[PDB]
Design a protein around this nucleic acid. Structure first.
Ligand code: K
Ligand code: K
Ligand code: K
Ligand code: K
Ligand code: K
Ligand code: K
Ligand code: K
Ligand code: K
Ligand code: K
Ligand code: K
Ligand code: K
Ligand code: K
Ligand code: K
Ligand code: K
Ligand code: MG
Ligand code: MG
Ligand code: MG
Ligand code: MG
Ligand code: MG
Ligand code: MG
Ligand code: MG
Ligand code: MG
Ligand code: MG
Ligand code: MG
Ligand code: MG
Ligand code: MG
Ligand code: MG
Ligand code: MG
Ligand code: MG
Ligand code: MG
Ligand code: MG
Ligand code: MG
Ligand code: MG
Ligand code: MG
Ligand code: MG
Ligand code: MG
Ligand code: MG
Ligand code: MG
Ligand code: MG
Ligand code: MG
Ligand code: MG
Ligand code: MG
Ligand code: MG
Ligand code: MG
Ligand code: MG
Ligand code: MG
Ligand code: MG
Ligand code: ZN
Lengths: 38, 137, 136, 123
RNA sequence: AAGGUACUCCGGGGAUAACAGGCUGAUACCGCCCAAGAGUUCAUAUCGACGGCGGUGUUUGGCACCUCGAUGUCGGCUCAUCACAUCCUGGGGCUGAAGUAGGUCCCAAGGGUAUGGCUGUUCGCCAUUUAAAGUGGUACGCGAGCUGGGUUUAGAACGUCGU
RNA sequence: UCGGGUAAGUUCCGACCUGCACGAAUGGCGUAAUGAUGGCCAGGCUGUCUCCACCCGAGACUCAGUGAAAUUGAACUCGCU
RNA sequence: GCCAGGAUGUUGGCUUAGAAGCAGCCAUCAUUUAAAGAAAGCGUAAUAGCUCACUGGUCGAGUCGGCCUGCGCGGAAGAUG
């Protein structure tokens, strides 16, 4: 889990979702691409 | 402080004084010449390179080649000898240290290799710099 | 790092940075990076942004820097008290007002230019915007 | 009841005659070692041409204490001196070949079974 | 018409310094943004040039607002109490995580969190432990609780400077 | 810095000389004996300490008698932010 | 969304140990087409493989992306409460 101020898509499979007032980058191809805004 | 190799010296001109001419003097003069040559000829450090012949099942070929290109080595080529692809490569002797264990780790203890000195090649500038520092002190 | 080759005087009063900028049009190229905020662009910042955009365009087309750091900025050494004369010059800056075209570019596609200017803008302390040359 | 600075006698033929405990092993702020406890020692007095020399830092097992050991009936066994048996720093096995003086049943473990065999008496 | 005073003295000043507090945050420490690169290949496992934006009050400083009809000052001892930017133990994501063992980040402050050699030391280095030997705040916590080694009275000497 | 001593020695002892900035009666270098003199080490010894326990006395406490002191604008004199 | 196709000179060439869409550098094409990049990704020593774009079928009404602008969100750790 990468916790950063600047969260973004790093691929075409990476997806931006907001959960419980948190912007997150969930990915179906690469676990390295999983990010949380914080 | 390493023996200088692969250098040609051409004695084109010189001088002598019959009275003061001594073979020892000329030997000293020769040394001085080599010294000044170094100041202008850009002496570089060379490292012993070894031809490595690695035989393994094709399944582990990618890993073997990766290890070589990681140890500052170059793959000279490959050949499908028997059922175990043979990879020919040149790798620095210093880098080759510990290849046996890594080879067996990568090939599931199904890999074998033979290393024999091939040539002397220039050491990477960074590594060479370290060598000079070490030899200096 | 841009700096005047010679100056009439070594040091300059602080001054103020009010008003709108002069030179608000893309005058040399097709695309430009315009300042929307107010501040001081240092020479090092100007260099960093230039190096970034130059690499991005991969030595294609031409780049004009419309800003020069002509104002000397002094600083006092540490552990020195107030007074005892003005400090020594440490770096050179350019005063920027809203509307100033900082960089212009030509000889590239707009998409490459927009990307290159984005990379350079990240090295700048002021907010910027992409602009294209107009007929009038 | 051995602590740091406590001088012990040696109950083996390793060559050491007097050792000093420099650490009680096996826990933070651990105060004392009794019979069966392993300590870190330094050799203070050794005989010429021994297995060990003066100034050596190794391990030892305490085998006799003036404080003594308690038995499950409330009985006590006390000795006249504090005595230890030197061990290898790594293997923690006896350096000597012979044990001198009595030992206790508190050393009846797999680790210290050699001492029990070599010991003249186990009390 | 030149100096010395630690042998000193008087009148004054927090109008003006040293200590601690305050304001400030350059500097310091912590975090983030951009990503050239390093990482065999692969920016972002780990790391990160050139530059950019913050946070803390936390070092070196700036200022001279409080105290000069007195706010005892280093280190130790005794006794602590808080923060969390977590040293150990608990939970978890990623990993360049086979296992063992690590790296890195997130969550978590309940409890726990060496003895010695040397030196006034804080510290540091060293020896040997430990699950770990945390980082800070508290008048650099604590002398109407202790100490008095450091340091800044009067004695004396050396080097040095000076007739 | 090197050597000794210690498990570990910014001190000590023996060297080295690179004397910031020794040096010859504002004496130089030695020196037996002497010293409530400065530094360092060892044996003995121990509550100095690990880590304090118990005991004997004088106070402290209670009762009777006598009976101070510094200080003090006035007080109906709590915590926190 | 879903069901299909997603190619042929050709592995473009050079370079490259190897480089074949997917190391790099030059090119930079043509062909059959409904359409298919001398390849946008994953993947491989290299290939392959796995996609995608593109396109065709199906489906049956809106849909997609910039620009300006109002109010919010994360970025955001401290010491007695
Ligand atoms: K005077
Ligand atoms: K931050
Ligand atoms: K990678
Ligand atoms: K004062
Ligand atoms: K504390
Ligand atoms: K982890
Ligand atoms: K805790
Ligand atoms: K204070
Ligand atoms: K004190
Ligand atoms: K007080
Ligand atoms: K008192
Ligand atoms: K004289
Ligand atoms: K004399
Ligand atoms: K003496
Ligand atoms: Mg006075
Ligand atoms: Mg004032
Ligand atoms: Mg005032
Ligand atoms: Mg102050
Ligand atoms: Mg930087
Ligand atoms: Mg301050
Ligand atoms: Mg003022
Ligand atoms: Mg005050
Ligand atoms: Mg007063
Ligand atoms: Mg936290
Ligand atoms: Mg607590
Ligand atoms: Mg709490
Ligand atoms: Mg609870
Ligand atoms: Mg210590
Ligand atoms: Mg204090
Ligand atoms: Mg503290
Ligand atoms: Mg007192
Ligand atoms: Mg007090
Ligand atoms: Mg004193
Ligand atoms: Mg005096
Ligand atoms: Mg003199
Ligand atoms: Mg003089
Ligand atoms: Mg020494
Ligand atoms: Mg001592
Ligand atoms: Mg000496
Ligand atoms: Mg003299
Ligand atoms: Mg003379
Ligand atoms: Mg004289
Ligand atoms: Mg003398
Ligand atoms: Mg009375
Ligand atoms: Mg209060
Ligand atoms: Mg906000
Ligand atoms: Mg709170
Ligand atoms: Zn992804």
């Amino acid at each position: 889990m990468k916790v950063r101020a600047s969260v973004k898509k790093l691929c075409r499979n990476c997806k931006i979702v907001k959960r419980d007032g948190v912007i997150r980058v969930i990915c179906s191809a690469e676990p390295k691409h999983k990010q949380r805004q914080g | 402080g390493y023996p200088l190799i692969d250098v040609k010296a051409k004695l084109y001109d010189g001088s002598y004084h019959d009275v003061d001419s001594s073979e020892m003097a000329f030997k000293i003069a020769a040394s001085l010449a080599l010294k000044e040559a170094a100041k202008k000829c850009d002496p570089v450090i060379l490292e012993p390179m070894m031809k490595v012949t690695i035989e393994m099942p094709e399944e582990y070929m990618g890993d073997i080649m990766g290890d070589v290109t990681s140890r500052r080595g170059r793959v000279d080529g490959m050949e499908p000898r028997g059922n175990a692809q043979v990879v020919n490569a040149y790798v620095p002797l210093s880098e080759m240290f510990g290849y046996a264990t890594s080879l067996r780790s990568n090939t599931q203890g199904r890999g074998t290799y033979t290393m024999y000195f091939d040539h002397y090649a220039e050491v990477p500038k960074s590594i060479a710099e370290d060598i000079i520092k070490k030899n200096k002190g | 790092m841009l700096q005047p080759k010679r100056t009439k005087f070594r040091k300059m009063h602080k001054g103020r940075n009010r008003g709108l900028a002069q030179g608000t049009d893309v005058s040399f190229g097709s695309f430009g990076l315009k300042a929307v905020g107010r501040g001081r662009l240092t020479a090092r910042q100007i260099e960093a942004a230039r190096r970034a955009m130059t690499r991005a365009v991969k030595r294609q087309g031409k780049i004009w820097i419309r800003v020069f750091p002509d104002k000397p900025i002094t600083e006092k050494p540490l552990a020195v008290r107030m007074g005892k004369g003005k400090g020594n010059v440490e770096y050179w800056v350019a005063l920027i007002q809203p509307g100033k075209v900082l960089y212009e570019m030509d000889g590239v596609p707009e998409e490459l230019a927009r990307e290159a200017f984005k990379l350079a803008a990240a090295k700048l302390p002021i907010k910027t915007t992409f602009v294209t040359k107009t007929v009038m | 009841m051995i602590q740091e600075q406590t001088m012990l006698n040696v109950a083996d033929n390793s060559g050491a005659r007097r050792v000093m405990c420099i650490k009680v092993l096996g826990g933070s702020h651990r105060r004392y070692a009794g019979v069966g406890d392993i300590i870190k020692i330094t050799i203070k007095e050794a005989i010429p041409r021994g297995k060990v020399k003066k100034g050596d830092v190794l391990k030892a097992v305490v085998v006799r204490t003036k404080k003594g050991v308690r038995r499950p009936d409330g009985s006590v066994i006390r000795f006249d001196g504090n005595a230890c048996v030197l061990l290898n720093n790594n293997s923690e096995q006896p350096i000597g070949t012979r044990i001198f003086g009595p030992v206790t049943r508190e050393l009846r473990s797999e680790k210290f079974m050699k001492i029990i065999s070599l010991a003249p008496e186990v009390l």
